[PDB]
Each structure stands twice: as C-alpha cells, then as structure tokens.
RNA sequence: AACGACUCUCGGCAACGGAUAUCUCGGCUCUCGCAUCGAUGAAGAACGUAGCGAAAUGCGAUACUUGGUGUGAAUUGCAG
RNA sequence: UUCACCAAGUGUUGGAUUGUUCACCCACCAAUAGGGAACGUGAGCUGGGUUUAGACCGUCGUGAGACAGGUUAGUUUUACC
RNA sequence: UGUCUACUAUCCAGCGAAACCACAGCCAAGGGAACGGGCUUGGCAGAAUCAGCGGGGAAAGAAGACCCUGUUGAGCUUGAC
RNA sequence: CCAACUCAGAACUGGUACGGACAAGGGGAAUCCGACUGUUUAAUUAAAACAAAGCAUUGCGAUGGUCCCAACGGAUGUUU
RNA sequence: GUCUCCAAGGUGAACAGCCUCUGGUCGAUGGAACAAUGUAGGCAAGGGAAGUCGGCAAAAUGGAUCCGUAACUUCGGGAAA
RNA sequence: GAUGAGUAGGAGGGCGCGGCGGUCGCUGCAAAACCUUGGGCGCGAGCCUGGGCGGAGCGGCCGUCGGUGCAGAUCUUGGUGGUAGUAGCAAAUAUUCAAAUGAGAACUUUGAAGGCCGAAGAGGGGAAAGGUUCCAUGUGAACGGCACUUGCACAUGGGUUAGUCGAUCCUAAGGGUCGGGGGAACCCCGACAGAUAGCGCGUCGCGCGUACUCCGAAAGGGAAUCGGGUUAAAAUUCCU
RNA sequence: GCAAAUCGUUCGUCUGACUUGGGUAUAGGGGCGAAAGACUAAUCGAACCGUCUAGUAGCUGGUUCCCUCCGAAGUUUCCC
RNA sequence: CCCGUCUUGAAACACGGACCAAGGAGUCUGACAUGUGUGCGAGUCAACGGGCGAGUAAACCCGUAAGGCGUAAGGAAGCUG
RNA sequence: ACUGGCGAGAGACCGAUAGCGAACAAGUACCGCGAGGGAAAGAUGAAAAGGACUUUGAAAAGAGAGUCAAAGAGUGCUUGA
C-alpha cells in the first residue's frame, strides 16, 4: 500500500504561494516560506548553492529604480533644471 | 519530383506518387510485390477483390507469423497471403490520380501497364505505451512513400 | 474548487489569457522566428502547481 | 534444380538520418576606466497596460508611453 | 537350492513412519537386481528440508551475539529468438 | 482419466511494443582453459513456410548477497585504545 | 361497528417434492504454545512475538525524583 | 487510492443475495472459427486420502420449528456440543 | 662484407589534423566537404589524380605551437536495425432492426426491441483537489493505444448577479508576540522579571481598571428568505 | 501486470484498546514506535537537497598513426 | 576458430562488444636531476623596478657596494681556513 | 586588491555534442510537497520573386505549368556522410 494506494491521499496542501517570492513554497503550519524564509525580514541566501544565487540575485527581474541610477549619475544627478527652449 | 527509375519513353508514360501515407509500410510493401509489371486494368479488378476478399495478396519478405490461404496459392505456392485493405485503398487512389494523367497527355489507357512501383519508409510518428511497473515504451507507426508509373504497352 | 481565493482567482484568469495561439500576423514580420506558442497549457497534461 | 520466391551479395537511383565543410548580433580569457541601491520605500514578487499580442522587451490607469532637447521625414506584418 | 556360461529382448510393483537420499516393516508378485545420463530432469512442477530478515528453548558469552543443536512462520520471475 | 460452458490461444481487418543480439546456429568422438556451433576425424547435408514445444544455446534478468582478499566501511556491544 | 398479523392444529393433494433459486456451521477424541479481546514486519514472516489485567521490585515529601535545554528556562505539574 | 448527504417495490430476520420502478446506461476495437496448452466455472461409474511433506484444493454441513445434548469447568460456560 | 623472431619496454626516422610567424601558389572558366566498379604511387601511416555533386573558399613548403589521430572503457550524446507485422487488444453479462446525416457509419443522432446498474446504484449533490474541463457553433492535421461524421481534442465566441448561502465574527488543540531573561549573531523562552489595554458616566471632568482589542474552524459556536417562474450555459443570488 | 503490491475466491473483526475527515504538536543520531529496527512522501540498522568534491582507492575497466632497430622479468634483500 | 582483455594457459561453457556518426584518456604547473642545443665564462643572470617604445601587453636600454647561484671548506658550536 | 556592477579595448581561445546551463520568448519549457533539479532548440534565396492557372481527388495531395542562376534552394528549406 506504500506505493500506488498511498499516492490516492493528495488532497492537503503543505505549502502555498509566498505573498514575498511568489513561489509555492510557504509552509502553512510552520507560517514559514522555504525558499525566501519570509516573514524574515532578511532574505534567504546560502554559499552552497550557487545556482540558487544566481536565479534569484539582483538583474533577474525588473530593476525598475537601479536601471536609471547609471543615467543620473552620468549627468551628476542634476535636477531642477530643463533645457534651454529651441529657437 | 525524381522518381527512383524513369520510364524509357517519357512521352508514352504517366506517373503519380504518394508522401508520408499513414499506412504500414512492410503491408504496403507487400501489396506493390503483387502490382509489379502488370496491366492497368487487371491491377485496379485484382485489388477491388482484395477488398471484397476475393483475392489475397501474398507476403513473401514481411511474412514471419502470416495466416495461410487458398487464395494465395496461384502467386505463392506455401499460401502465405492477407488481405491489407487500407494498403490496397491508398495504391487503387494512386493508380486512379495516375490514370487521370494519362487521360490529359492524350495515353491509350487500356494498353497501360505498371512499369515501375515502390514503397520507401517515411518518417515515423511517435507515441507511447504503458507498461507493467511503470514503464514507458514506444508506440510507433510506419508511413510510407509510394511512387508509380503506368506506361503504354508498345507493339 | 468553488471556494477559492481572489488571489487565486486572478492568477487562474491570466493564465487562461495566456493559454491562446499566436497571433497569424506575428509570423509575417520581418526577421521572425516565433513559429507558435512555446508555453501553451492544457488543463489535464500539464498541473499549473498551485 | 530451368523460371520464379526467399536469403546473401555488388552497382545505379530513391529513401532514412543529420555527420562533414563553410558560416556566427554568442561564449570564454586578458587588460583598462568608473564608484552610482534603499523608509525621498530598494532588490525581488504580483497584476495590469497596444486598433489588431500570447511570450520576450517596454511601461504603470498619463500604462510598448507623457514632457524637454537633439536629429530632420518616417513606422511597417496589416489596417487606419 | 547352489556354482558357472551365452544373454540387457521383456519386466522389476501397492503401502505405514521419515523432507529425506538411506533405512525399516506390512503385502502382493515369475521377480520385487544394481547403476549412468552436469550426484539426468526448478523459464517442467513441488518447496517438506536446507540456507536471509520475525520468534521460542537449551548450552555458550559480561555483552552485542554464537551453535555441521531443536522448533514455528517465511514472494520460486521471462520464451514471441 | 473422460467430458461440458465461457474467455484466450488460433484465422482475419485495423492498430502495434519490449527483453535480448561478437559472429552465428544439425550431430558423434577427439584434443583443448580438463563439458565445442566454430578446431581435428567422421556421420551427413536440398528452396520458402505454419502451429506447438521446453533438451540445449553451461539462455535472459544483476559488476555473487555465500566464501576469501583490502592496511575499505557502517549498525550494534564491551573488561579494547 | 372497525381492525392489523403472529401462533397452533386438521383434512385433502403432487413422480417423497418442498430453507426446491438465492442464502447459509462439517462434526468428534487429544497434545504443544499463548489466559482472554487487542496489536505487529505498508510491498515474502499475523505468530508461540508485542500489549494486556494481575503480581513484584526501585526512586522521590518540592531546597525533591525522572527528563529536556547552547544558555535562559522548561516537561511530569490544572500534579502531591 | 480519495471525506460525506438523499435511498422505492417483491422475496426474507435483514440498506444479505436474487428480480423490478424512478434515474442512468449497453462505455469497454470488431469479424470468423471451436485444435493443443491455458485461465475461470462444472460434472462423473466403483472405491473413498490408497494421492501428497501435509486432506493443499474441492466436496460435504448450512435457514427455521420440535426433541435431545457428554466429558470438563474459574459454575459464568462448554452448546448451534 | 655480414646479417633479419619478438610480448612488457625503450629509441629512431616518417605519415596525418588545427593554428601562428614566413614563403610559394590555387579558386565563380568552380574552393572546401562529400560520392565513385575511374587510374596510379608508397613495405606502410598516407599521397597524387579522372569523373560526379556542391557554390565560396583552399592548399604546398620552412620554422614554431597544440584541447592533434579510436573498434572496444556494462564508454558519452544522437541516430538506426534484427527481434516483428511478432507478444499482444480477453475483468465489470449485449447487443439487434429500420431510417436520417455524411466522400466514408459495427462505433454519430432519432425511433423500436432485447439486457444491465437495482436506492451502502453504473442515480441525484457537496467538501478537498483541479481550473474553464461548463455552454453554443464549427473543424485541415495531431490526439481519444480499432474507427469516428465523433470530443473532457482543436478553433471562435458566450457563461459564475446575494443585507438573508458562505467566508467574514467567536473561541479550541495550538500559533505568532511586547516587556523581561538568554544569545558572537542567525535565533531561544513566550504575558514567565512589567507605569496593560482601555472602559463607563457626565460634559474636558469623575468612576472603574488582574500586561496580548493578535492569528487559529467554508464539518465546533453563530443576526435574518420563502414558495412560483426564468437560461444554450446562472440562481435560496436573476424575475414576480 | 489493470497495478513499482493489483485481481479472484476464501478468510479476521465488527459498540469498542472501534473506524474515519479536518485542524494541531513532535524533524535526522533527531522524531515517533502495544517493539517488526517498524515508520518518518515508492527513500530508513540513520530520510531528502545542495555543498566540501574532480573525496581516496596497493582494486576492475579503458588508454587513439606507420615502419625500423634493440629487447625482458616472475629472482635477491627490506617493508603490519 | 572472434576481436579486445586479465592470465602459466583463451576459439573457450572467462568478461566487454547489436549497428553507425561524432565526442572520448600521461596534460598544465612548481621543485630537483641526467642528457643534449645555444650564449657568455670566474663569472653569469634586465628577473622587482626604472627609461622608453611598434601612437606602443612586443621590441630596445639601464645592476650605480642590489639580489640569486657560483667563486672555500671543515665544525654541534666557540672558531679556524 | 577586485571571477560583482556599469562602460571600453583586446586575443596564436571555442565555432552549435564546441564555447557559459543558456548564440534562439534560458534560468525558459518541464520535474519535485519542498530545499532544489533543469533541457532541447542557429543557416531558403541577392531579392518571397513563398509556386497564378489547368486537371484528378471528400481532403491531404498528385500530374502539368509557373518564379529563380538553381527548386537537383519549396517555409526545421545551404552543403546532405
Ligand atoms: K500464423
Ligand atoms: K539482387
Ligand atoms: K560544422
Ligand atoms: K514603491
Ligand atoms: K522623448
Ligand atoms: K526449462
Ligand atoms: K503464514
Ligand atoms: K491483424
Ligand atoms: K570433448
Ligand atoms: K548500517
Ligand atoms: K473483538
Ligand atoms: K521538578
Ligand atoms: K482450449
Ligand atoms: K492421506
Ligand atoms: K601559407
Ligand atoms: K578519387
Ligand atoms: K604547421
Ligand atoms: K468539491
Ligand atoms: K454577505
Ligand atoms: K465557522
Ligand atoms: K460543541
Ligand atoms: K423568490
Ligand atoms: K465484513
Ligand atoms: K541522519
Ligand atoms: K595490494
Ligand atoms: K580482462
Ligand atoms: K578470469
Ligand atoms: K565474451
Ligand atoms: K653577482
Ligand atoms: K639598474
Ligand atoms: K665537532
Ligand atoms: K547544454
Ligand atoms: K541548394
Ligand atoms: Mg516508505
Ligand atoms: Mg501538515
Ligand atoms: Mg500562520
Ligand atoms: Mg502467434
Ligand atoms: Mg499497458
Ligand atoms: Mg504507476
Ligand atoms: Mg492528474
Ligand atoms: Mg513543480
Ligand atoms: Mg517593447
Ligand atoms: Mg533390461
Ligand atoms: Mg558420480
Ligand atoms: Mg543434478
Ligand atoms: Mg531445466
Ligand atoms: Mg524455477
Ligand atoms: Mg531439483
Ligand atoms: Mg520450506
Ligand atoms: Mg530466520
Ligand atoms: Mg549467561
Ligand atoms: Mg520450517
Ligand atoms: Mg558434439
Ligand atoms: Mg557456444
Ligand atoms: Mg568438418
Ligand atoms: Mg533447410
Ligand atoms: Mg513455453
Ligand atoms: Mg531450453
Ligand atoms: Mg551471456
Ligand atoms: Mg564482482
Ligand atoms: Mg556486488
Ligand atoms: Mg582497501
Ligand atoms: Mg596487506
Ligand atoms: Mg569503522
Ligand atoms: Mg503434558
Ligand atoms: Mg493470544
Ligand atoms: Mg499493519
Ligand atoms: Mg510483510
Ligand atoms: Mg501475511
Ligand atoms: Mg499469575
Ligand atoms: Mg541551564
Ligand atoms: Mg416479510
Ligand atoms: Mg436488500
Ligand atoms: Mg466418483
Ligand atoms: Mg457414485
Ligand atoms: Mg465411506
Ligand atoms: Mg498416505
Ligand atoms: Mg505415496
Ligand atoms: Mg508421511
Ligand atoms: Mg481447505
Ligand atoms: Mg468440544
Ligand atoms: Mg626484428
Ligand atoms: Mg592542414
Ligand atoms: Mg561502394
Ligand atoms: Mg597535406
Ligand atoms: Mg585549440
Ligand atoms: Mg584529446
Ligand atoms: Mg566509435
Ligand atoms: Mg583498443
Ligand atoms: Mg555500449
Ligand atoms: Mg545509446
Ligand atoms: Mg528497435
Ligand atoms: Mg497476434
Ligand atoms: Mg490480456
Ligand atoms: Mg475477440
Ligand atoms: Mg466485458
Ligand atoms: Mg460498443
Ligand atoms: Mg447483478
Ligand atoms: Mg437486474
Ligand atoms: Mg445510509
Ligand atoms: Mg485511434
Ligand atoms: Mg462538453
Ligand atoms: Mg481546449
Ligand atoms: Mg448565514
Ligand atoms: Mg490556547
Ligand atoms: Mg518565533
Ligand atoms: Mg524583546
Ligand atoms: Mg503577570
Ligand atoms: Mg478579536
Ligand atoms: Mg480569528
Ligand atoms: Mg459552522
Ligand atoms: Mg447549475
Ligand atoms: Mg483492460
Ligand atoms: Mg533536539
Ligand atoms: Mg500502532
Ligand atoms: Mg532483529
Ligand atoms: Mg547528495
Ligand atoms: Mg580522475
Ligand atoms: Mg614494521
Ligand atoms: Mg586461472
Ligand atoms: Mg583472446
Ligand atoms: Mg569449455
Ligand atoms: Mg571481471
Ligand atoms: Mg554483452
Ligand atoms: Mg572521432
Ligand atoms: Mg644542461
Ligand atoms: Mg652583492
Ligand atoms: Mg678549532
Ligand atoms: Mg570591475
Ligand atoms: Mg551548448
Ligand atoms: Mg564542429
Ligand atoms: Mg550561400
Ligand atoms: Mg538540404
Ligand atoms: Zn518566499
């Protein structure tokens, strides 16, 4: 009955999505996310995986802010000025 | 596009193929054998009695288990013979498509014959099977491509 | 099942706007590559995981 | 012990398959320059957003973009 | 009845107890001779024994455990070449 | 031992795998890594094919678990360090 | 005036058939082991193995017995 | 393999088995033959465990009513003896 | 003039692959690669050349360099055979006739007949879990291990309406915590080392005040909806 | 193989140490165990995942072009 | 007689090998040693760095009491040489 | 000092089983409850000029014709072992 019969009992979910990562990986009972360890305030991170690292480091996703931090500082972070009108 | 072998008068001669016909091709195979060198007219009334069957069509090559009959007793003295249906519909449409050829190149149709036929595996299509202790296995089949040419029997 | 979450809700919705053919015109630009919807799903084959 | 079938064998052609050759907006390695994330809400995650789009890329209800400036006549798969 | 010769053509059995091979007894029979064939024969069977893992006894060992000692329960796979 | 029913097997249409495969596949004796399909000497030996069969292929399944070796372990024990 | 279905008996009758299908204990005389019901090696062992009530021994009067813990403390203990 | 609600008539002690109504359904690839071997279900003269490690398997018993019921016993049972 | 065996092993002289520094050349009047029952050279590794295919690069020589030579490793990845049209399709009792539709019907639909589930169902719902599988129309292929005109497949569009049904509220086993106590820190204990939260009544004042206003049940506790009708697909939610 | 444990018949128990859903607590030399070294996601006499790690191996297997020349040893001593 | 392999001994009833393509294994680095080639020679070495320079990671130049190795050994050492 | 970030130059390096796992909607598809695991997949032609039309077929498609230097380049299409 180990095998196939004990398969048939599927139907209580361990973990759910992590309102922080997004992976289904939020341990229900433990209140715990597996993969982020939310609700830490620190993220969850280990030297021994560097492959774990690198899908989820800084530039897998949106940068939405850091991408424009290059630009301004090019320009000094000037701000409150415009350029002189055509003539 | 190129046939494996060319008719000697092109003029007198019509020709028609099929590509990748869902249809075994050791059947297929068997099914041309039978086909070879023989008159338009006989070829398309022996295979119509295949379907009815009338007549068998022998296997000589892919015949390891095959039934034996009386109907294939004339042709193949041992009596190893079949009737593939679904083989003899996908070859009585080529002949017809070849038939029409020669209607519009102007050929005598009853004096055609089949000077050439042949039966080329094609790629196969793949799916699976489910096996004891959970296993996967292939589950294959084996189309075909068919080539043929009718020529005019020369006086 | 038919007690669900919103959460859940509105991700199973952008998955089905997801689950579509390309677009026919999308094959016709220039420099195209994109032959067909390398991400299609179906219900039964494939479990969305949450 | 012909003929023909079968098996094997040699050649032509046709199949099967994707090797080889020639390529390369990629990789790898060395060197150089620079010092710039975040409670003024970051990295990450989610959802939405186009006349016709799913993804990728972009963007945030002003949503494949607003404004200024430069350039100076396109965009383009289609439509308008 | 005994000894010996040609001789392997034909036959050489039914049972109690034992996993047995071996043995022993009962009974029949003309006779109940002895052996080989990978100690013939497990993709022919059977699995009683032996020879995994559970368990008990005796003896041995401080102990874990040991015993050509006894005991009881213990999956016998595949042919289409 | 016989016989009866059903479903298979069997024949057909359609569909259609896998294990396995040095090359291969008739025997006797001989010698040989001491038990050959191949070598030596003989018996012999005639296309293609069907249903069954378990003698053999020291058949398949698995880098023997038994035993031994290694200056390899591991579980457990104690009067070992 | 209106009642439901349990029991008992008699006559007659069929090719002795009649719980007619379905359903549904074989029985007896003893030995070994375990008292019994219960439990056990999911996928080779269901047992004589485990548990069990009963019996007996041991520690402890809280500044305590047994035990957990890196530390702080905690379980038995809403206890005696 | 996977929790739970509703539950008709007849036979009968009975949400036993067997048949039926409401509702559902003929979904399991089909055709032709009726060899061996097999799987499942049966039957059998006379004998009745001689089979086999062993009564394995199967057969036999079976409901209800009346009568009747021993050893032994912890007096409750044994007993549907 | 003599002489010629060789595993393990050593060494010499050579062949071949890809770069680099040089040098000499070839090529759209056809380079590389590949194919050949063409021919030749070398003991040999190999080399040269005819013909074909192909359509843009390539070679010789000197020196120098290296991820530089395969039959094996139960070698790696990919491809392909024999086995073989073979093993095999066999549980859950069962189908038959006529007609319609269609290129095509043992398998679609209608009607008739014969059977089965037999209310602890093969019937009618729901909780988990799934997530559009729901409904309509259409359909080339693929898929539904035979077939299909078929569909839980594919394509296009449509569909889920609540003061009363639930979640929401309450607390359970328990979970997460302040302060405090530990701890290099991640963390450990968890209202136990403490100026609680605030509430009530007047109109800002009086009174009260025992350290969590937290999480934890779509089966526990719990404010209130019933018929009748309505869609291709929704209703104790829409209409009356 | 329908099935990496199922199918058929036959069997144990069936008001209780009964069966079962959901919630919740215990996590790897740890848990849990009416005790079989059982069970802890087909993994248990110490789970699973990544890393240290290309772990070490006196042992098994393999180890890629041509000719030419020379051409062995299984014996000595010492060594867990 | 079938190759490869371990072996005193393989055609072996020893193991790997169904077939094809491509990939696939004594390398790089530090230290030392013998041999050989080259330069200079009681010396030798441009090595850290500097000066520059193919507008330049090369090449060229620089050792002024630098440093390494060598030029003197023996001794535990004090020392002597 | 600098295998991260941003920008830049270079190479006796690799040339789609190579080189980063990833030359491409690659940390993507897919697998696992989870920690994690993690692919395959580049080339028509100079230009789509991407094959009008006739005829056969239910359709796929074939035959003839057409474009092109070439369909012996016909939408996974250079060469094609
Ligand atoms: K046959
Ligand atoms: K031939
Ligand atoms: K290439
Ligand atoms: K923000
Ligand atoms: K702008
Ligand atoms: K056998
Ligand atoms: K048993
Ligand atoms: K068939
Ligand atoms: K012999
Ligand atoms: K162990
Ligand atoms: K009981
Ligand atoms: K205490
Ligand atoms: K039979
Ligand atoms: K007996
Ligand atoms: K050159
Ligand atoms: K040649
Ligand atoms: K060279
Ligand atoms: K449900
Ligand atoms: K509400
Ligand atoms: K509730
Ligand atoms: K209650
Ligand atoms: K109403
Ligand atoms: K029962
Ligand atoms: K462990
Ligand atoms: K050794
Ligand atoms: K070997
Ligand atoms: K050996
Ligand atoms: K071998
Ligand atoms: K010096
Ligand atoms: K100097
Ligand atoms: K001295
Ligand atoms: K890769
Ligand atoms: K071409
Ligand atoms: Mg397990
Ligand atoms: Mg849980
Ligand atoms: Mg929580
Ligand atoms: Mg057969
Ligand atoms: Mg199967
Ligand atoms: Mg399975
Ligand atoms: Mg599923
Ligand atoms: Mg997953
Ligand atoms: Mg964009
Ligand atoms: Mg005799
Ligand atoms: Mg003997
Ligand atoms: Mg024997
Ligand atoms: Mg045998
Ligand atoms: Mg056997
Ligand atoms: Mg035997
Ligand atoms: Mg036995
Ligand atoms: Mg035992
Ligand atoms: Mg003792
Ligand atoms: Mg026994
Ligand atoms: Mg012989
Ligand atoms: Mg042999
Ligand atoms: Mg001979
Ligand atoms: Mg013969
Ligand atoms: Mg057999
Ligand atoms: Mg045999
Ligand atoms: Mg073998
Ligand atoms: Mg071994
Ligand atoms: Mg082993
Ligand atoms: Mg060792
Ligand atoms: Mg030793
Ligand atoms: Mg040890
Ligand atoms: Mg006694
Ligand atoms: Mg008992
Ligand atoms: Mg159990
Ligand atoms: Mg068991
Ligand atoms: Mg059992
Ligand atoms: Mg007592
Ligand atoms: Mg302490
Ligand atoms: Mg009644
Ligand atoms: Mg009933
Ligand atoms: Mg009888
Ligand atoms: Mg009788
Ligand atoms: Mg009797
Ligand atoms: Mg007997
Ligand atoms: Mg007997
Ligand atoms: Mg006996
Ligand atoms: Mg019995
Ligand atoms: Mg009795
Ligand atoms: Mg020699
Ligand atoms: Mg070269
Ligand atoms: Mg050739
Ligand atoms: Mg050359
Ligand atoms: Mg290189
Ligand atoms: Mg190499
Ligand atoms: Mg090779
Ligand atoms: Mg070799
Ligand atoms: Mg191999
Ligand atoms: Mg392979
Ligand atoms: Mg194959
Ligand atoms: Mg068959
Ligand atoms: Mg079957
Ligand atoms: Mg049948
Ligand atoms: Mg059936
Ligand atoms: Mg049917
Ligand atoms: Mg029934
Ligand atoms: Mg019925
Ligand atoms: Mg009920
Ligand atoms: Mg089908
Ligand atoms: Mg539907
Ligand atoms: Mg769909
Ligand atoms: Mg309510
Ligand atoms: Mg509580
Ligand atoms: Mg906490
Ligand atoms: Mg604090
Ligand atoms: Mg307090
Ligand atoms: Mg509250
Ligand atoms: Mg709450
Ligand atoms: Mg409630
Ligand atoms: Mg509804
Ligand atoms: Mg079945
Ligand atoms: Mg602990
Ligand atoms: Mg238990
Ligand atoms: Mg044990
Ligand atoms: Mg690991
Ligand atoms: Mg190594
Ligand atoms: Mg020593
Ligand atoms: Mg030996
Ligand atoms: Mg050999
Ligand atoms: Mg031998
Ligand atoms: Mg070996
Ligand atoms: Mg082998
Ligand atoms: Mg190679
Ligand atoms: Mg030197
Ligand atoms: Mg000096
Ligand atoms: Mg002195
Ligand atoms: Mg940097
Ligand atoms: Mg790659
Ligand atoms: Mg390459
Ligand atoms: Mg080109
Ligand atoms: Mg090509
Ligand atoms: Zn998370």
Same mark, same amino acid.
């Given at each position: 009955?180990?095998?196939?019969?004990?398969?048939?009992?599927?139907?209580?979910?361990?973990?759910?999505?992590?309102?922080?990562?997004?992976?289904?990986?939020?341990?229900?009972?433990?209140?715990?996310?597996?993969?982020?360890?939310?609700?830490?305030?620190?993220?969850?991170?280990?030297?021994?995986?560097?492959?774990?690292?690198?899908?989820?480091?800084?530039?897998?996703?949106?940068?939405?802010?850091?991408?424009?931090?290059?630009?301004?500082?090019?320009?000094?972070?000037?701000?409150?000025?415009?350029?002189?009108?055509?003539? | 596009?190129?046939?494996?072998?060319?008719?000697?008068?092109?003029?007198?001669?019509?020709?028609?193929?099929?590509?990748?016909?869902?249809?075994?091709?050791?059947?297929? &195979?068997?099914?041309?054998?039978?086909?070879?060198?023989?008159?338009?007219?006989?070829?398309?009334?022996?295979?119509?009695?295949?379907?009815?069957?009338?007549?068998?069509?022998?296997?000589? &090559? !892919?015949?390891?288990?095959?039934? &034996?009959?009386?109907?294939?007793?004339?042709?193949?003295?041992?009596?190893?013979? &079949?009737?593939?249906?679904?083989?003899?519909? !996908? $070859?009585?449409?080529?002949?017809?498509?070849?038939?029409?050829?020669?209607?519009?190149?102007?050929?005598?149709?009853?004096?055609?014959?089949?000077?050439? $036929?042949?039966?080329?595996?094609?790629?196969?299509?793949?799916?699976?099977?489910?096996?004891?202790?959970?296993?996967?296995?292939?589950?294959?089949?084996?189309?075909?491509?068919?080539?043929? $040419?009718?020529?005019?029997?020369?006086? | 099942?038919?007690?669900?979450? %919103?959460?859940?809700?509105?991700?199973?919705?952008?998955?089905?706007?997801?689950?579509?053919?390309?677009?026919?015109?999308?094959?016709?630009?220039?420099?195209?590559?994109?032959?067909?919807?390398?991400?299609?799903?179906?219900?039964?084959?494939?479990?969305?995981? %949450?």
């Amino acid at each position: 009955g180990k095998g196939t019969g004990s398969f048939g009992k599927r139907r209580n979910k361990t973990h759910t999505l992590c309102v922080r990562c997004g992976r289904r990986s939020f341990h229900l009972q433990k209140s715990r996310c597996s993969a982020c360890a939310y609700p830490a305030a620190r993220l969850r991170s280990y030297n021994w995986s560097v492959k774990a690292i690198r899908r989820k480091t800084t530039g897998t996703g949106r940068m939405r802010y850091l991408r424009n931090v290059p630009r301004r500082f090019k320009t000094n972070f000037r701000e409150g000025t415009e350029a002189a009108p055509r003539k | 596009v190129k046939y494996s072998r060319e008719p000697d008068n092109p003029t007198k001669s019509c020709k028609s193929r099929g590509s990748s016909l869902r249809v075994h091709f050791k059947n297929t &195979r068997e099914t041309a054998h039978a086909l070879r060198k023989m008159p338009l007219d006989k070829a398309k009334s022996y295979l119509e009695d295949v379907l009815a069957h009338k007549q068998a069509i022998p296997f000589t &090559r !892919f015949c390891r288990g095959v039934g &034996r009959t009386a109907q294939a007793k004339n042709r193949h003295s041992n009596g190893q013979g &079949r009737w593939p249906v679904k083989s003899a519909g !996908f $070859i009585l449409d080529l002949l017809k498509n070849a038939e029409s050829n020669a209607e519009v190149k102007g050929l005598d149709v009853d004096s055609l014959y089949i000077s050439h $036929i042949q039966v080329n595996e094609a790629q196969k299509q793949r799916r699976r099977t489910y096996r004891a202790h959970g296993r996967i296995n292939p589950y294959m089949s084996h189309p075909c491509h068919i080539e043929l $040419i009718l020529s005019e029997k020369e006086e | 099942p038919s007690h669900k979450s %919103f959460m859940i809700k509105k991700k199973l919705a952008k998955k089905q706007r997801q689950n579509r053919p390309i677009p026919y015109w999308i094959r016709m630009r220039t420099d195209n590559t994109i032959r067909y919807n390398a991400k299609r799903r179906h219900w039964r084959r494939t479990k969305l995981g %949450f």
